[PDB]
Ligand binder design. Structure first.
Ligand SMILES: COc1ccc2c(c1)c(CC(=O)O)c(C)n2C(=O)c1ccc(Cl)cc1
Ligand SMILES: COc1ccc2c(c1)c(CC(=O)O)c(C)n2C(=O)c1ccc(Cl)cc1
Lengths: 115, 116, 116, 115
């Protein structure tokens, strides 16, 4: 699993569950091509988005539908989403965990890139 | 000054200076139309992006060029940018302070929204 | 004004107003001696905690009463406080902006340190 | 495992490995009593700090030696540490993950409290 998304809820101190996540790869014409998507699990995790063969070097956008999440909880969100855009660079072997910590008017995102 | 961007460097504990910031507004055809852009000052602040008149309702995207920032400091960062997308002025005009806190492999973005 | 505290509410996208902030300085006997305290203003800022003369080298602890803040807003928060401990003025006097961003179950604390 | 500490490095995008973590419980005389400690693993995780029998309701301080971590990497840190102070409240069953995201001049901490 070369790309994992973890989403947490800083309001309730919980995994952010059932959050729609879309992954896009930047196409040669500079447009975002849908690549993978899912909903975060009960652990606020989204596994199996892609495989190592599919996850080639490129620019990726991870779009987390944070707004729908906050709408489900009845809390007015600021952001339309959380958009995590990064270069997957092959180098040595790598696994990407895109973590998002969500608040209504704030999100933080971090990459954990490991061997 | 209804839209301000404040960028901080979490490695140096300083304002993130001369960070390029691009603001786009979602057009009727769902494309991102260039709305405004600028550089953060020495205080890591970007003022005068827009006006009360120009800053109408819409979905705005603030794209903060964090990559070029980190690269100029000799760091290869993870993200291409910090990018804040939001509906502005849905309940009437508000003042928006978009703050980004930057680390090479992480950023947070927060909004202070106030009613003038 | 060598020490400023800025508290933001990440739920409301607003300054965190009337947040009690206690500053302690580590004494020679390793105890935390009360150094200064105050409330954040309407802008979520706390100015005038100390002076250049008073704010000597040391290890300082800034304790932000986030719990009472969230409780007054009807939220039972996780943390008792946001609490920033740091060595101040080791390389000579600096200006410190301690910023805290608050969510009921999370906070970030950042320092902007500048040379006057 | 009723209390888990996870520490990440926002500079290198990695688990924060070998970070000393001390857990304290507030004693009746209002002093911090050492309760548990460890060093974060290769996954930046600290498991087995306590047991459900030991982890009674109370006020806990999780102190993360962030400064030593940054000193090891040769990066000048702002904070002496990251001090996470919270009330463990029994309620229904609970597991506490104290996560810290570390930058030299910034730390964020989040609680993930689950069943
Ligand atoms: C006026 O609104 C803000 C917002 C955030 C601020 C600040 C001011 C100042 C200082 C000031 O301008 O007074 C600092 C040091 N801030 C941060 O540390 C910070 C925290 C979270 C994020 Cl996501 C981004 C930046
Ligand atoms: C429930 O347990 C957590 C909590 C946070 C986590 C992770 C796992 C992983 C999983 C991993 O990559 O190992 C990443 C990347 N997390 C973060 O980004 C993060 C976000 C906010 C804070 Cl305050 C601290 C850390």
């Amino acid at each position: 699993c070369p790309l994992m998304v973890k989403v947490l809820d800083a309001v309730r101190g919980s995994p952010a569950i059932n959050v729609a996540v879309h992954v896009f790869r930047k196409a040669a014409d500079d447009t975002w091509e849908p690549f993978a998507s899912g909903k975060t699990s009960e652990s606020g995790e989204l596994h199996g988005l892609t495989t190592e063969e599919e996850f080639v070097e490129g620019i990726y956008k991870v779009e987390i539908d944070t707004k729908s999440y906050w709408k489900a909880l009845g809390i007015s969100p600021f952001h339309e989403h959380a958009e995590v855009v990064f270069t997957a660079n092959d180098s040595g072997p790598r696994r990407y965990t895109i973590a998002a910590l969500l608040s209504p008017y704030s999100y933080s995102t971090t990459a954990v890139v490991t061997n």
